[PDB]
Amino acid sequence: VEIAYHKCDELITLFNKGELETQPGCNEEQTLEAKIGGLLSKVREEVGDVCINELDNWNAPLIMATCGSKGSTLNVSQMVAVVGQQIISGNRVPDGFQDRSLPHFPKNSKTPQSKGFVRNSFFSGLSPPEFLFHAISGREGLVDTA
């Protein structure tokens, strides 16, 4: 994660000064969000695979996902390893204030802690900005079932 936090911080400092080349469908802000969202989505895969390959036999949620009972291998990962990016409407967490998402982060911050990447597991227990960012994506899918 600290590699992913260091690579995402060597990518915004190339963005505050205008330097980032873009994919041919996006501008410089949107091509940041693909390089910074596609890099947080690969450390659920890195840290998730370190999890599931490590839990022993006669692990209970590993049996209930090998069966096809209640459980996915992602649900087990979020309870043990990183819960991961809280995607809201396809994007990250929107700026709920003037130029940041939440007053506990500095203004003009695109750091992954600030835009919705929760790192504590459910066993670890979610931090107070991690708690709210996960709670927004919960209701966004709780009203998408009504």
Binding site: P61, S69, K70, G71, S72, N75, V76, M79, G125, F131
Partner: protein, 150 residues
């Protein structure tokens, strides 16, 4: 006034959004038992945990268990509360397992169960949705005077 006891079909819940109904009532020599002889009041399925990801219910049981063995009420307040690594200190202090999993015997066949059973006190609350106030049935009865349907 009316007194009423749990029937098949009353709703109980824990404090973790896991609503549930009473499916069977079991004779207490058929329940599993530990070395001290404690039998459960509720048996809860392990299949309501992985899809729902209520890990804070797995900590309510240990903090509930270590607290009642210590004699103190514990705390599960948000962003804090009692810690799992020293609720598991009280729990080895007695001679229970640190993880809250006990070796229960089987009440039906007498044998050791082949898994350790996660076992302790959860706070259950009983809901107002009771099957006595919900079971109804009609053969023939009054009809609406306009449509002459039931």
């Amino acid at each position: 006034r009316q007194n009423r006891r749990p029937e098949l079909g009353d709703k109980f819940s824990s404090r973790h959004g896991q609503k549930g109904v009473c499916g069977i009532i079991v004779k207490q020599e058929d329940m599993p038992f530990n070395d001290q002889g404690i039998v459960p009041d509720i048996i809860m399925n392990p299949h309501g945990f992985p899809s729902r990801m209520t890990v804070g219910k797995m900590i309510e049981l240990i903090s509930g268990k270590a607290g009642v063995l210590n004699g103190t009420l514990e705390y599960g307040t948000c962003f804090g509360g009692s810690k799992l690594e020293d609720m598991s200190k009280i729990l080895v202090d007695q001679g229970f397992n640190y993880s809250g999993k006990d070796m229960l015997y089987s009440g039906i066949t007498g044998e050791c169960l082949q898994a350790y059973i996660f076992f302790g006190p959860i706070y259950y609350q009983k809901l107002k949705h009771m099957v006595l106030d919900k079971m109804h049935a009609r053969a023939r009865g009054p009809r609406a005077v306009l449509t002459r349907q039931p």
